[PDB]
Every structure is written in structure tokens, then in C-alpha cells.
Design a binder for these strands. Structure first.
Ligand SMILES: [Mg+2]
Ligand SMILES: [Mg+2]
Ligand SMILES: [Mg+2]
Ligand SMILES: [Mg+2]
Ligand SMILES: [Mg+2]
Ligand SMILES: [Mg+2]
Ligand SMILES: [Mg+2]
Ligand SMILES: [Mg+2]
Ligand SMILES: [Mg+2]
Ligand SMILES: [Mg+2]
Ligand SMILES: [Mg+2]
Ligand SMILES: [Mg+2]
Ligand SMILES: [Mg+2]
Ligand SMILES: [Mg+2]
Ligand SMILES: [Mg+2]
Ligand SMILES: [Mg+2]
Ligand SMILES: [Mg+2]
Ligand SMILES: [Mg+2]
Ligand SMILES: [Mg+2]
Ligand SMILES: [Mg+2]
Ligand SMILES: [Mg+2]
Ligand SMILES: [Mg+2]
Ligand SMILES: [Mg+2]
Ligand SMILES: [Mg+2]
Ligand SMILES: [Mg+2]
Ligand SMILES: [Mg+2]
Ligand SMILES: [Mg+2]
Ligand SMILES: [Mg+2]
Ligand SMILES: [Mg+2]
Ligand SMILES: [Mg+2]
Ligand SMILES: [Mg+2]
Ligand SMILES: [Mg+2]
Ligand SMILES: [Mg+2]
Ligand SMILES: [Mg+2]
Ligand SMILES: [Mg+2]
Ligand SMILES: [Mg+2]
Ligand SMILES: [Mg+2]
Ligand SMILES: [Mg+2]
Ligand SMILES: [Mg+2]
Ligand SMILES: [Mg+2]
Ligand SMILES: [Mg+2]
Lengths: 187, 124, 105, 147, 52, 52
RNA sequence: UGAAAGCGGGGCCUCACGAUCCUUCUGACCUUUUGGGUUUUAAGCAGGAGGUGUCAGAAAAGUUACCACAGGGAUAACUGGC
RNA sequence: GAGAAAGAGAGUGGCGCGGACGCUACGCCGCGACGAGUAGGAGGGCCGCUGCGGUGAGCCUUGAAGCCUAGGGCGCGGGCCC
RNA sequence: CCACGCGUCCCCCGCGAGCGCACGGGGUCGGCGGCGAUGUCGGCUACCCACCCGACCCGUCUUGAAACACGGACCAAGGAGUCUAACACGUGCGCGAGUCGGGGGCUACGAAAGCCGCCGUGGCGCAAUGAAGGUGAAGGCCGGCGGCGCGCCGCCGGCCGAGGUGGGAUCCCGAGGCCUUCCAGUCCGCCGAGGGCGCACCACCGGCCCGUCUCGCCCGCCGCGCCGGGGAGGUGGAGCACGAG
RNA sequence: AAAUACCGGCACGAGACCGAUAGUCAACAAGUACCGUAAGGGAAAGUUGAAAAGAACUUUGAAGAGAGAGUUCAAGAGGGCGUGAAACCGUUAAGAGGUAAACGGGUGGGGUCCGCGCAGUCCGCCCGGAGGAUUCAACCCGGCGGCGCGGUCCGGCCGUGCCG
């Protein structure tokens, strides 16, 4: 025979989205072409990011967009998001932004446009810049989800600040034998 | 548009027909009668179709005009060609080529016109 | 016999719960019955207000809700007496009375 | 849909997804959350620490209405009032300062988390924090109590 | 457009409603692809089939 | 798209009238058959009587 | 303690020991005791102890030849096998 | 397709009316290596059954469902068409 | 001998054509011959029979079953991971610091569907922590007014104003050149030495809030008190550190 | 009083339910037949055909049962009668037969039918030879269509654009 191990023989990654959305698949049909037929790897990253799941493309907020476009050097560039540019109400003055996301929520659209900005989609993005140059690609906060407060080294195991699955935060609900030192032992 | 309509009609249309590990599309202006984006007779701004005439001789060639897209009555134009087999095919060839009118399927129209004319000369 | 990680929980199905289960398939029949009765009453008291009597501004009790004003139970006797309305004539001319309400303000 | 679940693919397979050696018996580790001290000790130590035992005082007749005091932050303090009040206050040169009644919005207590923009305010709250008050003062502004 | 709203005025006969925004606007893919913006910035096609 | 054609009203004898109303923006809201199938699947279960 | 460097928070090292609930004692001008205040009282918070030697910790005597049920050739009373 | 970072790039002066297939892009095509399997996990079913919304200007007394068959066949197979 | 000619400065000694054959990116013949109407021609498979090689009866529990292990005479129909609730994670969809009318109300299929918005009551989220009273999530610089053997700074007006280190997909600048006769020489792209701004994320150091301990000096006044507020250094938290529900 | 609850009763309407081993125990002379001393247990069991037109009459036997004749579209629907499978059985035909039968791989032989086989494909262009049409190009008139290559023709309409 041959002594291969066939355990990891299959790459797990996505070839296509698991959505039957049709505007998303037409964006896929455009970026399959641009990634297959340009040499720029922005199109391969945008192809792989249109492929992803809702929890793999998290929404960055307008505050992250403001800060990460105010980093010096990338003036009058084009922010490129594959998730959702949501509004962030704890910012007041918004600069002129040139954004490109799949979906921008309503008051964030009003905010950017009356700041004086311009909101593109990916089709007119690819008409504006096919190799995608002059673009700052950005991502949402991906460990921002609350399900990551439960992940990692278990609770009840020292040096591990993992939130446990408790049906109610209270006084009687997991405070006693592993948490105290007067009751039992502390970790 | 056209791709937007194709992403709907590609699987849940009524002209589609799926059996015997084949697939076809029974729509009224489909050269080669098969389910494809290239040949579909409903989702384009310009489309030819090759039909046998109501009189039992010759070919009515259907063109889709440019202006009245959303107006299905004054959208298609019929031309009846009742000639020999050479000039019928030459007329369909010039009509699709020299108008630059959707030249993806000039040869499919010529095949379909020839198959109709084969079936329209008498049987053995 | 619990698995690796997950919220340990107290489901209250240890009784016989299937014998006592109230299912709501007459929810829209109940709504149609109530609005048939509401239309019948609202046309049998023919010019009078359909909502019933008038009920006072009164303020919700506790620390969570005392900034909110509701419609209460009925007008107090002190309120009726300062407004001149007799406490037995009010229920006839359409005013709701309860005798239990204080007035501390 | 039972068209899509696992029991369709498991027809023909003799054990139906539960093994031949250890079968699918009825309740092999007790009903429910049983054996907390005894034989699921490692699960309730490794995954639910603090579960067994008592801590703290017993409050008998508890009322969330008594203990009700929700919070706003300084970071979202200006959400509560419309945008034209902000731009009129910044546009104004007479020094007049808008009054934000947080209790009208429904938050009893102002906390100070974020940056507050440099406009004079009058924040009319029930309770305050030390940092919320001193950020209001440092911007210029007043902290008005209302019971 | 009174019931379901337009793209700039809201729904006059709903409470809080406006039409849902598109995810790509220029839906015609072939006019995007056969356009002088993209056809400049592409490598050459290798369609020489190289069988074994 | 973004533009709005001018749909004519047809008189009850069939021939086109002189009245001509613009196409509302509902007719250029996006076509999504998956949302239509989803809402149809979940709402054609609500007119359904029990059995036991 | 030694003059000093230093050494010492038990025994030269390797064993000599015990979770939750409960009780008891110790601690602070501490917190709660419920509409307010004082005072006892109770509840807490933190640290020892009272103990589970089946020692990660049920509170527990036999008999059945009148016997039964679920199983086991995981396991005895026969032959057969090494 | 060609061993060699990158243009069969634009600019300024010294008769015959002709050309196959294709591209359900979830499609089609090209290279390589690979194929054991109980408990188990996953994927694909144009495998199958019963009923509902769509649809085939579907089928049917010029004979539907079913049942039988030394007949013609397809698919690795589930099965299916005659 | 896989060596080709000319013209010049130096030293030591870039387009020639035509055909044709083929050990050359996988087979063709531009080669043939027979038999065919009442007895023959083709059909692997499906009907019966023969021969050779192989060939123990299934399910099951088992370390091991053809077992002298148990179940099974044969057939037709029925016959076993379902539904409700709770939780977790993954995935699709809508809205997004919000979100949901589920309960109520208003208007054949339709007990559907639509609508409410001063019906968001309410849930979950947006804030943690403590047993509890409770408290409740950047700082720095300037000017003025050992204070002494608060150079720190207490208090006042202004200014900067929301960490850093390392690695980082992406992008940004561009030493140079990508020839069609040669030189200067513009415009359009392209490749790249070197250098940048650095998303998510990870590792680390800092910082902030609640408890707790230790050490200290200040500050506030309507009630100067067993009052209240402050700081520095560790440490306990399911926290913050520009939402993710 | 009202809002509220209702697997008994009177009278209804409906169903992404079941379709005679299902759905109630019960589609029928079902709480019936039957068992038990009793309390109580409790089935099986639907369908000719359109219409009985349910086979007059002859003939053998004592009769059940046949053979003819007849009704019917059909008795290949004949009073427990639609359709009528499997296990099992009778008979006919074919084939075989001493390692129980059966089986997998490989062919061989014999049947059964199928191929409507048994002088065997056609399709373009070209040359030559016999024909026949009211006949091709080019022009004219009308209509229909397609497209700055009208740089920059006149006018509307629209903007998920701007300014007055
Ligand atoms: Mg191998
Ligand atoms: Mg393997
Ligand atoms: Mg694997
Ligand atoms: Mg398990
Ligand atoms: Mg298996
Ligand atoms: Mg399993
Ligand atoms: Mg088993
Ligand atoms: Mg197990
Ligand atoms: Mg075991
Ligand atoms: Mg279980
Ligand atoms: Mg134990
Ligand atoms: Mg020490
Ligand atoms: Mg008391
Ligand atoms: Mg008292
Ligand atoms: Mg005895
Ligand atoms: Mg026994
Ligand atoms: Mg022996
Ligand atoms: Mg395998
Ligand atoms: Mg043998
Ligand atoms: Mg067994
Ligand atoms: Mg066993
Ligand atoms: Mg054994
Ligand atoms: Mg085993
Ligand atoms: Mg044996
Ligand atoms: Mg035995
Ligand atoms: Mg056994
Ligand atoms: Mg047996
Ligand atoms: Mg069966
Ligand atoms: Mg789990
Ligand atoms: Mg998820
Ligand atoms: Mg009804
Ligand atoms: Mg029956
Ligand atoms: Mg039956
Ligand atoms: Mg029955
Ligand atoms: Mg029966
Ligand atoms: Mg019958
Ligand atoms: Mg019949
Ligand atoms: Mg019959
Ligand atoms: Mg019968
Ligand atoms: Mg027989
Ligand atoms: Mg015989």
C-alpha cells in the first residue's frame, strides 16, 4: 500500500457560501472572476470574506471605522468591509468617509451621508477599483461575541476567568464551594 | 436585470423539465430548448426564436425588440420566411450577424431552422 | 448524566403535567367572541361612551413607576365633593367612584 | 422537519447510533442532575464551581421595585436628547446650557464611562457617580438632583 | 408608495418602515464584466488546454 | 435599479388611456426568493388545525 | 537568637490525616434584622475546631430448604480441554 | 506553455458579406496523488412512501391504481423506465 | 568539429525563402474476405441444465461463532430515537445598540393576513461587583496662588486630548527598467530593492471600576461627627479597555 | 353580573389526521356474540353488478355437484360474490438428477421471446449527365427591425444626484 494517514486529507474551508441569497451569489460571481483573473490578493481576501458565515464576518461599528481610518497615512482612501457598518452612537463628529460594505444600517447611512461621505456597494466598488487599490480592508471585532466568555480553560480550574453557564446571575447561583475559601476551596 | 432573473428562473421555473438525468426548458423562444443562461428566451433584452409557421411551409423568426421590455404584447416581432432552404438560412444568418443582434446563437438558430425545414419537407 | 459543559437546570416536569395543559387553539375564537360582545354592548348603550365611565389621573405607587401617570379606578369622594358632584349622581352621569381612595396631596 | 434529521440516515444500521457494546439503556447515571456530590463530582467541579453550599444573607420578601435604579453612562448621555439641541448649544455664543433630564428618559442614575463633549450641560438625575459628576464639572456643567 | 414607502420618503401608512436596501445595485453582471474599467486590469487568459 | 418608468393606466375598453402614474419603488425593492420561500413556509403553517 | 554574616514562619528529607449542610469559639466602634430609631436576639463576612479509617466523605442486623425476578457461562458445583 | 521582476502600449522632435462545439458558472474542463474498515461521525441521493402549497393548457373508459411476467433496458447501488 | 562573413578601437601571445522526410504534445488504413428468407444471424444480463475453481447460516453478546451459545417452520400486513419544554454550539435570514408583539386591540379559503407605536407594558441586550450597606469602568502638560532638609505638587484658567511592544492578511510611497532601427523625451498601466500606516487575532507590559489587605498624608460643609471624599502598593471578580445583540 | 373553566349532554362547522391489522372497543343485529359465581373481561366481522337482469329450459345423479343454453361489456363479477399477490398445492410444458439443497467467478449447451434484422447507414460541398419552375443578383415602392460612430439634431421622462 502506501503509508499515508488520510485524517487531514481534506481541507475543511468553504468553496461557496451556505446562503441561497442571490445578491450575495452575484457578488460571488463577480469576485470569483476578479480573484481568478487579477494578480491582486485583495480580491482573494474579499472572495474568502464573502464566502464566510455571519459569525465569521462580525459587524464593525462606525467608531472602529473612524479610528482605524484616522490612523495616519490612509487619508482619502476607501474603507472596505464585508460585514455590516453599524452606527455607533457614542461618537459625535463624523469625517468624510468612503465606505464599501454589504449592508449599512439606516441611521449609519444617514450619519455618513450627511457627514458628506459616500456609501458604495461591492459592484460599483469593483467598477471603481478592480484590483482594489486605494482601499483599507477592515474587520469587525470577532472575539466580541458573548459566547467567547465561555470558551477556553474551564471554570473550576485555577487561573481561568471563564464565565460559566449559570441560569441566573445571583447570590445563590454558583458562589459557594469552588468560589469561596470559607466554603471548601478556591480556584 | 438578466442575471437576477436567471437566479430565480434557473431552478423553480415551470418551463424547466427534469427527468432521465437530462434537463430542458420548454419556453417559447429557446433555441436548442435547453436550460441555460445563454439560450433562455425570457430574461434577455434581445432574443431570437425559430418557429414553424401556421401555414405548413417555412419559418417564422421571432426577434425581441429593444424599447418595450415590460410591454409583452408589442415586444416580439415576427417575420415569416417561406423560401428555399439556402436563402432561409442566409436570411437568418444575415439577420443575426449583420444586426449584431445577440450573436451567441446565430448558429443555433441556423441548426433549428434547418431541423424545421427537414421536418417540413415530406416524410419518407 | 450531564455532558461536558452546559447550564445545569431544573425543569419542573417531575409532576404529571400532560393531564393539566392549557392550549390556546381558541385564541382567535376568543378574540372574535370578545369583540362581538364589545360591539353588542357598545351599540346597546347607544350614545354613551364605549369605553365605560371616566377614570382619574392617578399615579403608580412604587419607586419603579411613580414618574408615570395612569388611568385609575375611580374618582375619590374628596375630589367629587370639591367638584360639587354628588357621590351617587356621579355613577349615573357617567363618572366612576371609588370610596377607598385617599388624597394626601 | 424529520425529512432532514439523523434518524433517516440511521435506518438499516442495527444499533441506531448508540453502539453495540454499551447500548442505549434507560438512565445509566441517574435522572437529571443527580449524583452531584458522589459520581458526577468531576463535572460539577470542572464546570460548575461554587454550586453546592450557602453564602450570604437571606432577604425574605424581596421587591425589585424597591431595589430599582437603572443606569445611563456619560458616553450615551447625549443620546437622550435630540441632535438639534447639541448643535444649537454648540452654535450658541450666549453661554446657555441645555438641560438633560435623564429621569424623563427613564434612567435613574448617571454613571461616567466615556468621553463627554465640551459643551456646558445641566444633568438632572436622581443619583450620580463621583466620576460622572467630576467629568460634568470639568466640561463645565451642573449636576441637579431630583427625587 | 404610501403604504410601502419610496427609497427616500418613509412609509406613510406604516409606523416605522422604509424599503430594504440593496446588497448590490448594478445587478447586470455582464455589463460590469465587459466594461473598460475591469477589462484593463486583468491578466491574459490561458485557455491552451494542456492534456497529459 | 434607481429609475422609475411611467406606467400607463388602461381604460376598461382595453386601449391605453391618457393617465400615466410612475412606477412605485416597491417594484424595485430587491427580489429574494429565499426570503419569500422562508416567509411562505413559516406562514402557511398558521392556518393549520391540530390532529391527534 | 548571634558579636556578626546569617539562620528561623515547626520537627534533617521521605507518612502521621478530612468536603457541603450543621454546631461552637475568635475578629472589627463592620453589614442586615426590612416603614423609622434605641436595645437584646438572630442572620452574615473571615479564621480555627467538632468528622466522615468504605479515609473525594450513606445514617443500617439476620434468615429463606416456602422462596421469587432481571440477567451471567464475566462466575462455582460435571465431563471435556492446556 | 514560455527556464529567467515586468507592454504582440499609445504620443513628440533628430471581387466574394464567411468563421464547428460551448457557459444548467451549483456549469464545463485540465492536471497529480489516492481508495481497508466494526462502534461511530459526516456528506450526496434525477433512491423510495404518504399528504399540502405551486406547477406540467400533465396522464386517464381509445382503459388510471394494483397484481403477474421465459420480454427490451438503464443505473456501482437504492431503484426506475418500457 | 553545434566553427564562417565583413569593417574598425583595445591587449597579451535581430523579420531570406520554398518544398519534403520523420524512432517527434497517446491509431490509423487514401487495405481486404466470407455468409445471408423459412433457417439462419445478433441479445453479456433474465429461464433451465452441465463442468472447473471457490464456497459452513443468518442476526447477535463476545477477547474469539459455522459452532455441541441463544432467537429463526414458511408467508402477508403491522413494528421501534417521536413530540413539548429548557440549555448549549454551529449555520441561514431580518433589523442592528438595539430588538421582539408572542398577550390585547382595530379591520369560503380566512382560526389566515394586515395594522397598532402615548398598546415596548415586558423580556433579553446595552455594566460590573459585594454576603451586605453600597460603589459603579484614560490621563498628561503649561501659567498663577525639600510647603519644607502638599522637586513633588493642594487649588484655580487654558492646551493636548482615549495607551504601548512584537508578529500580522490587506493596502501606501517607489532606487530601477519592461526593446523593434538609434538618441532625447511626455502620458497610460504593469514588476520590484528598500521604507511606511497597520484590520481581525494572538503573546506581553501598562491603565480603569467593585471587594479585600497594607502604608500614609491631604481635602469638603447646612448639620465639624464613631461624618463624607481622596491617594500609593499588592491581591479576589463570570468586569472595562470605542458595542453585538 | 362580566371577563374565566368544560375530554358529560343538545345542535353544528372544519381538518397538511386515519382509510377496515389504521382510526374509538365498535364503519356491520357492538358494549353484541362469548367467558367468569362475581367484581369485571370482550372480540371477529366492509365492497356482486350500472341495473338482479341472481342463471328460464334440456340432460346424468338421490342430492350436493356438473354439462349445455342464457343475462351482462364482463360470471376471467354466480348470493362471504371488486382487485385477487405471497407462503403452500394440483396439473401441463421444458430441463435435470448417486457427495442435502442452495450460492460467487468463468464460460458452454438448450429453450423462450426481442431485434418487425436477413444484400444493410446516411449528411454536406463538388464534377458530369438527363429534366422541370415564371426564377437569382442588381434596381423601384411600402412596412418592420437593429445601430457619436448625428463628435455636439430637436423634445420628453427619470435620479438611491446637486444648486438655485
Ligand atoms: Mg492502494
Ligand atoms: Mg481510512
Ligand atoms: Mg478528516
Ligand atoms: Mg455520552
Ligand atoms: Mg454501521
Ligand atoms: Mg450517537
Ligand atoms: Mg446489542
Ligand atoms: Mg454509554
Ligand atoms: Mg461494558
Ligand atoms: Mg436518555
Ligand atoms: Mg460516595
Ligand atoms: Mg520574613
Ligand atoms: Mg421585623
Ligand atoms: Mg417598630
Ligand atoms: Mg426446613
Ligand atoms: Mg427465572
Ligand atoms: Mg473435570
Ligand atoms: Mg472506505
Ligand atoms: Mg472445491
Ligand atoms: Mg444474543
Ligand atoms: Mg452482556
Ligand atoms: Mg464468553
Ligand atoms: Mg467487541
Ligand atoms: Mg463446540
Ligand atoms: Mg443450550
Ligand atoms: Mg441468551
Ligand atoms: Mg428455536
Ligand atoms: Mg412490512
Ligand atoms: Mg452540550
Ligand atoms: Mg450561531
Ligand atoms: Mg373554517
Ligand atoms: Mg378489515
Ligand atoms: Mg383491506
Ligand atoms: Mg377496526
Ligand atoms: Mg379482513
Ligand atoms: Mg373482498
Ligand atoms: Mg372486466
Ligand atoms: Mg369484476
Ligand atoms: Mg374474486
Ligand atoms: Mg405451478
Ligand atoms: Mg417432465
Amino acid at each position: 500500500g502506501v503509508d499515508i494517514r488520510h485524517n487531514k486529507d481534506r481541507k475543511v474551508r468553504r468553496k461557496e457560501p451556505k446562503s441561497q441569497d442571490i445578491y450575495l451569489r452575484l457578488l460571488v460571481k463577480l469576485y470569483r472572476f476578479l480573484a481568478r483573473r487579477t494578480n491582486s490578493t485583495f480580491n482573494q481576501v474579499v472572495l474568502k470574506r464573502l464566502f464566510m458565515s455571519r459569525t465569521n464576518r462580525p459587524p464593525l461599528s462606525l467608531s472602529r471605522m473612524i479610528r482605524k481610518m484616522k490612523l495616519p497615512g490612509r487619508e482619502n482612501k476607501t474603507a472596505v468591509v464585508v460585514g455590516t457598518v453599524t452606527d455607533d452612537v457614542r461618537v459625535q463628529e463624523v469625517p468624510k468617509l468612503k465606505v464599501c460594505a454589504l449592508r449599512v444600517t439606516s441611521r449609519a447611512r444617514s450619519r455618513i451621508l450627511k457627514a458628506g461621505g459616500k456609501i458604495l456597494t461591492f459592484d460599483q466598488l469593483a467598477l471603481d477599483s478592480p484590483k482594489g487599490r486605494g482601499t483599507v480592508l477592515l474587520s469587525g471585532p470577532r472575539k466580541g461575541r458573548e459566547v467567547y466568555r465561555h470558551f477556553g480553560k474551564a471554570p473550576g480550574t485555577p487561573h481561568s476567568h471563564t464565565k460559566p453557564y449559570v441560569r441566573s446571575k445571583g447570590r445563590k447561583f454558583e458562589r459557594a464551594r469552588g468560589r469561596r475559601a470559607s466554603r471548601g476551596y478556591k480556584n | 436585470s438578466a442575471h437576477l432573473q436567471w437566479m430565480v428562473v434557473r431552478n423553480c421555473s415551470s418551463f424547466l423539465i427534469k427527468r432521465n438525468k437530462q434537463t430542458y426548458s420548454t419556453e417559447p423562444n429557446n433555441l436548442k430548448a435547453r436550460n441555460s443562461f445563454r439560450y433562455n428566451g425570457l430574461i434577455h433584452r434581445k432574443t431570437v426564436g425559430v418557429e414553424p409557421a401556421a401555414d405548413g411551409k417555412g419559418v417564422v423568426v421571432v426577434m425581441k425588440r429593444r424599447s418595450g421590455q415590460r410591454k409583452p404584447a408589442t415586444s416580439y416581432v415576427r417575420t415569416t420566411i417561406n423560401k428555399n432552404a439556402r436563402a432561409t438560412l442566409s436570411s437568418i444568418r444575415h439577420m443575426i450577424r449583420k444586426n449584431k443582434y445577440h450573436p451567441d446563437l446565430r448558429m443555433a438558430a441556423i441548426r433549428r431552422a434547418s431541423a424545421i425545414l427537414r421536418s417540413q419537407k415530406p416524410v419518407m | 448524566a450531564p455532558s461536558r459543559n452546559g447550564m445545569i437546570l431544573k425543569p419542573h416536569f417531575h409532576k404529571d403535567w400532560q393531564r393539566r395543559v392549557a392550549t390556546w387553539f381558541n385564541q382567535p375564537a376568543r378574540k372574535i367572541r370578545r369583540r362581538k360582545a364589545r360591539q353588542a354592548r357598545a351599540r346597546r348603550i347607544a350614545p354613551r361612551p364605549a369605553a365605560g365611565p371616566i377614570r382619574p389621573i392617578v399615579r403608580c405607587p412604587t419607586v419603579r413607576y411613580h414618574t408615570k401617570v395612569r388611568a385609575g379606578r375611580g374618582f375619590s369622594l374628596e375630589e367629587l365633593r370639591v367638584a360639587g358632584i354628588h357621590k351617587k349622581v356621579a355613577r349615573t352621569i357617567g363618572i366612576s367612584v371609588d370610596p377607598r381612595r385617599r388624597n394626601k396631596s | 422537519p424529520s425529512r432532514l434529521r439523523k434518524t433517516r440516515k440511521l435506518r438499516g444500521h442495527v444499533s441506531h447510533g448508540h453502539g453495540r457494546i454499551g447500548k442505549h439503556r434507560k438512565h445509566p447515571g441517574g435522572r437529571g442532575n443527580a449524583g452531584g456530590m458522589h459520581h458526577h463530582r468531576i463535572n460539577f467541579d470542572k464546570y460548575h464551581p461554587g454550586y453546592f453550599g450557602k453564602v450570604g444573607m437571606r432577604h425574605y420578601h424581596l421587591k425589585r421595585n424597591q431595589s430599582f435604579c437603572p443606569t445611563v453612562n456619560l458616553d450615551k448621555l447625549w443620546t437622550l436628547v435630540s441632535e438639534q439641541t447639541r448643535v444649537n448649544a454648540a452654535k450658541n455664543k450666549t453661554g446657555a446650557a441645555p438641560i438633560i433630564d435623564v429621569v424623563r428618559s427613564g434612567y435613574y442614575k448617571v454613571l461616567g464611562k466615556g468621553k463627554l463633549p465640551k459643551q456646558p450641560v445641566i444633568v438632572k438625575a436622581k443619583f450620580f457617580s463621583r466620576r460622572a459628576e467630576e467629568k460634568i464639572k470639568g466640561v463645565g456643567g451642573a449636576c441637579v438632583l431630583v427625587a | 408608495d404610501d403604504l410601502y414607502g419610496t427609497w427616500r420618503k418613509a412609509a406613510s401608512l406604516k409606523s416605522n418602515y422604509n424599503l430594504p436596501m440593496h446588497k448590490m445595485l448594478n445587478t447586470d453582471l455582464s455589463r460590469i464584466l465587459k466594461s473598460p474599467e475591469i477589462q484593463r486590469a486583468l491578466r491574459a487568459p490561458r485557455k491552451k488546454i494542456h492534456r497529459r | 435599479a434607481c429609475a422609475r418608468p411611467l406606467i400607463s393606466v388602461y381604460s376598461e375598453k382595453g386601449e391605453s388611456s391618457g393617465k400615466n402614474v410612475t412606477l412605485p419603488a416597491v417594484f424595485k425593492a430587491p427580489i429574494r426568493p429565499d426570503i419569500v420561500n422562508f416567509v411562505h413556509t413559516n406562514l402557511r403553517k398558521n392556518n393549520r388545525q391540530p390532529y391527534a
